[PDB]
Design a protein around this ligand. Structure first.
Ligand SMILES: C[C@@H]1CCC/C=C/C=C\[C@H](O)C[C@@H](O)C/C=C\C=C\[C@@H](O)C/C=C/C=C\C(=O)O1
Length: 359
């Protein structure tokens, strides 16, 4: 039925368990599906969030998704385009008057969705003493006080701040807070069971935490250095992230719950970057690849086993969602780790896609 070589499931499990036995990894969990039917799901290891008596890592365990929150932000922006409240060609300065200045006056909403607005990866937090980074207006004024890194449409550079701006734009046009909109129109609309901007106290002991820096961040009611939680701050689980990825693969709907039109998702899933533009990620050059409307189309093709057209996104944590429309295949994973190690985040993608057989 799923057309999958189960020997690669044993290889995938042994790959995660080996890193767990070696101390390179505390826990790991994944979930893969063919044609919308989950045929393999597993959680490995434990985590030290409860100090001693290590908490078992389960499939419904809650954990931050990091930059996967930006995928929720991209859906919200495109929902407002569907309603006629936003247009991707709108200059940001028409909504945020602080952008009415050289350089920033050319940034359109489309540039923020595709990381082509020239913004740097982050803002200098320790250099903004005496300003309230939680306030929207004072955060934007310090942002436009910062030099733009590249010109608009001149380079692809992943920017966390770019999607915080989108969350502010969502709030200014809808009249409700960003977190209020995403909760009603995406989280509840898609039927996400264990996805929260702020975990209720009854469920906090079911949240996986590997560093007490995350244990203290679980009890906060607002983002520490961002005016909103538009680029990171969501807590979720494998089943919910899998539902979100399957919504894109089915072009905007999941069973009876429709989040976007199928023509909207097609535009989000096609490449939006002009050819020949250089790609940068975290101060280092990155290989060029397709990037849609808030959705990543890379890695795919080339030497990778993922078919050309595979959309994805990664989140610090780490976590990730990968869906192959050509194979009706979706793979989501939780790999809690404090450093990025490609052997734990990217290498299992080779193991997983090597098991796909003829549908
Ligand atoms: C495919 C790429 C990511 C490939 C992996 C490269 C990692 C490079 C350097 C360090 O690990 C950086 C890491 O410590 C923390 C810094 C940024 C983390 C961002 C996460 O929210 C993942 C977001 C990826 C977005 C686009 C992309 O372009 O994803």
């Amino acid at each position: 039925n799923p057309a999958f070589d189960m020997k690669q499931i044993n290889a995938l499990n042994g790959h995660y368990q080996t890193m767990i036995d070696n101390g390179d990894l505390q826990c790991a969990s994944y979930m893969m599906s063919r044609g919308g039917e989950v045929f393999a799901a597993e959680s490995l290891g434990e985590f030290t969030g409860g100090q001693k008596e290590k908490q078992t890592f389960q499939l419904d365990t809650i954990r931050e998704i990091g930059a996967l929150t930006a995928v929720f932000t991209a859906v919200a922006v495109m929902q407002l385009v569907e309603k006629g409240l936003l247009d991707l060609k709108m200059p940001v300065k028409l909504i945020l008057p602080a952008f009415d200045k050289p350089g920033f006056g050319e940034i359109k909403i489309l540039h923020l969705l595709t990381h082509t607005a020239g913004l740097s990866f982050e803002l200098d937090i320790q250099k903004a003493e005496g300003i309230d980074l939680t306030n929207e207006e004072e955060w934007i004024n310090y942002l436009v006080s910062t030099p733009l890194e590249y010109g608009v449409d001149e380079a692809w550079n992943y920017s966390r701040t770019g999607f915080v701006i989108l969350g502010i734009i969502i709030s200014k046009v809808t009249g409700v807070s960003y977190e209020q909109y995403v909760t009603k129109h995406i989280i509840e609309a898609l039927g996400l069971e264990r996805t929260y901007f702020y975990v209720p106290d009854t469920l906090k002991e079911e949240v996986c935490v590997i560093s007490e820096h995350e244990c203290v961040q679980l009890e906060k009611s607002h983002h520490p250095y961002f005016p909103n939680k538009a680029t990171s701050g969501l807590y979720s689980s494998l089943r919910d992230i899998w539902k979100l990825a399957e919504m894109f693969r089915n072009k905007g709907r999941l069973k009876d719950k429709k989040l976007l039109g199928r023509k909207t998702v097609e535009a989000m899933l096609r490449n939006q970057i002009k050819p020949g533009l250089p790609f940068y990620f975290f101060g280092a050059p990155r290989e060029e690849g397709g990037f849609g409307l808030g959705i990543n189309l890379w890695p795919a093709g080339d030497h990778y086993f993922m078919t050309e057209g595979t959309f994805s996104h990664l989140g610090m944590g780490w976590c990730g969602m990968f869906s192959d429309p050509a194979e009706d295949f979706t793979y989501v994973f939780f790999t809690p780790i404090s450093e990025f190690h490609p052997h734990a985040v990217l290498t299992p993608l080779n193991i997983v896609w090597a098991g796909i057989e003829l549908e």
